[PDB]
Structure formats: structure tokens, C-alpha cells
């Protein structure tokens, strides 16, 4: 018994090529390059799915530092004024968003002054 099987190979390569669309040049045409680029893209996806929560926290810190620097104290002093006194688990983003709807944030920053 002889088995040729050109169906399965083409279907597999078609899936790999379909994965990489919107790629420059031949990367979406030739399969040999498409597989390399899909592998590399998924590596980058795995690394960035961690780097982005590494970075968004930093952005929230930055936009909280800026808001507090216009009241007379720094972010590195505000965190004490949440943990030790008036123990609060308000998150590190929402205290950021509260500036985009301000004058409810000022209530926070003057509440810890007690």
C-alpha cells in the first residue's frame, strides 16, 4: 500500500501562513519564512504579556507622582500615608484614574493628613 498525502502538508502550511498576515515582503508568501516569523512573534507575545504589566504599573506610578507633586508631597511619602495611617488597600491605578476625575482625588490626598 502506498500513501501520498499532499492534502495534510498543504493544510498545515496553510495554517502557518495564515497565522502571519500583515507581514512585510515575502514573510506572508513563503512558508519557511512564515514559520520563523510566527515562532518569533509568539516569543515576543510571551515576553510582552509580562513586560506590559511590568510597564503599566510604572506608568501609573509616574502619573501619580505628577499629581502629588502639585500638592506639596511626593509619591514616595504618599505610600506611607496609605499603609501605616488609615490602612487603605486602594489600588495603584485607581488612585491614578481619580485625577482624570479630580476634586474627588483631593479628598484622598488631604484625608491622609491626619
Amino acid at each position: 500500500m502506498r500513501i501520498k498525502g499532499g492534502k495534510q502538508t498543504r493544510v498545515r502550511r496553510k495554517k502557518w501562513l495564515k497565522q502571519a498576515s500583515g507581514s512585510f515582503g515575502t514573510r506572508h508568501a513563503s512558508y519557511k519564512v512564515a514559520k520563523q516569523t510566527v515562532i518569533q512573534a509568539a516569543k515576543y507575545a510571551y515576553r510582552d504579556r509580562r513586560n506590559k504589566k511590568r510597564d503599566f504599573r510604572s506608568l501609573w506610578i509616574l502619573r501619580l507622582n505628577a499629581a502629588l507633586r502639585e500638592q506639596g508631597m511626593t509619591y514616595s511619602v504618599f505610600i506611607n500615608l496609605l499603609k501605616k495611617h488609615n490602612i487603605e488597600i486602594n489600588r495603584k491605578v485607581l488612585s491614578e484614574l481619580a485625577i482624570k476625575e479630580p476634586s474627588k482625588f483631593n479628598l484622598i490626598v488631604q484625608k491622609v493628613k491626619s
Binding site: 509568539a42 510571551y46 488597600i89 486602594n90 489600588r91 474627588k104
Partner: protein, 99 residues
């Protein structure tokens, strides 16, 4: 007006009539769930949590997020393992918040 609520493990800034997506809650469509934990309801800041304060939401749907197809591949060392993931979520909106 606003409120800050701990649903799942993420804290949410939530007003009236807003739809937000949280992690799976094990509750069928249409029922009302009272999220219990809450901090900073309205100018009223509970230090550990705001006691005797809830936010009442109606669950809209259970869904699966977009597929994340993770392939990990040691370079030039005989390894091409592949795995896929569809994190389930629940979308739900608020009706009003218990004072």
C-alpha cells in the same frame, strides 16, 4: 456617583450603568450578584474595606476572551512546544449601589 469595588482580584472604578468585565464568578445569566468588598464608595473611605456596603450588579454574559496561542521554542535545541489558552470572563453591569 462613582465607587471603587474589588471584584475578583482587580479593583474597579465604576459608576451607574457601566458594563465591565471581571473574572469568572460562577453565576448564571440574568441573576443579581452583590459584590461585597468595597472601598471609597462616595467621599466615604473605608480603611480596610467599607463595611456594610455592597454594589449590586446584573450579570450579562459568560464569554471566552480572544485566543492566546502561546508557542515556546528553545533556539536550535530540539523544542517546539505549543499550547493555547482562552481565558473565560464575565461581563456585567451595575443597577445601583447599596448605601
Amino acid at each position: 456617583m462613582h465607587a471603587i469595588v474589588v471584584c475578583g482580584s482587580k479593583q474597579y472604578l465604576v459608576h451607574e450603568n457601566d458594563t465591565f468585565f471581571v473574572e469568572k464568578l460562577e453565576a448564571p445569566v440574568g441573576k443579581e450578584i452583590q459584590l461585597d468588598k468595597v472601598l471609597m464608595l462616595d467621599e466615604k473611605i473605608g480603611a480596610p474595606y467599607l463595611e456594610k456596603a455592597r454594589v449590586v450588579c446584573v450579570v450579562e454574559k459568560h464569554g471566552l476572551q480572544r485566543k492566546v496561542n502561546v508557542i515556546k521554542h528553545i533556539s536550535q535545541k530540539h523544542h517546539l512546544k505549543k499550547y493555547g489558552h482562552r481565558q473565560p470572563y464575565t461581563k456585567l453591569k451595575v443597577v445601583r449601589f447599596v448605601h
